[PDB]
Design a protein around this nucleic acid. Structure first.
Ligand code: MG
Ligand code: MG
Length: 98
RNA sequence: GUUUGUAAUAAUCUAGAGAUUUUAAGGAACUAAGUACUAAUUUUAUAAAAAACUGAAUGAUUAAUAUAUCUUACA
């Protein structure tokens, strides 16, 4: 037999051309309430696909980048260095260096 | 409280060195309790750098994409 399975995903198509429009009007109506997680669970999709059909307005996106930047300034020199190492190992991996 | 011991003044007595009384007097390094009388008392004194890796469980938020082309829209 073959060795154990580690990653065998299954693609699904649960959204229709009409439901895609509902995802667009909702995301633009209230991006705070109709988050991508809420729309993902509502239409039984992946959080990525929700982002492939529509994007939040530029105003809602800037506050997301700020929220992640404010939590980053709370890191000390020891945690900020470990975070940067984790981001470099990933880039090095895809360059064939790891 | 404890300790030392009956200060001075005054009264009386005394050859006079002294005695008696006021007198358990007057003191005191010490102990205990109480008391803010003195000192803890000058305008952001100093030091302290501060959340690793992998697996598992379980959340939040988000383009967390690519290819073709050079024009597109407005006025
Ligand atoms: Mg005694
Ligand atoms: Mg860690």
């Amino acid at each position: 037999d073959l060795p154990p399975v580690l990653y065998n995903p299954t693609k699904s198509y649960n959204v229709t051309p009409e439901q895609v429009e509902e995802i667009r009007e909702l995301r633009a109506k209230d991006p705070k309430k109709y988050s991508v997680t809420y729309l993902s669970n509502k239409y039984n999709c992946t959080k990525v696909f929700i982002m492939m059909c529509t994007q939040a307005p530029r105003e809602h996106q800037e506050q997301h980048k700020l929220a992640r930047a404010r939590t980053a300034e709370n890191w000390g020199p020891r945690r900020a260095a470990a975070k940067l190492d984790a981001r470099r190992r990933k880039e090095m991996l895809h360059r064939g260096e790891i």
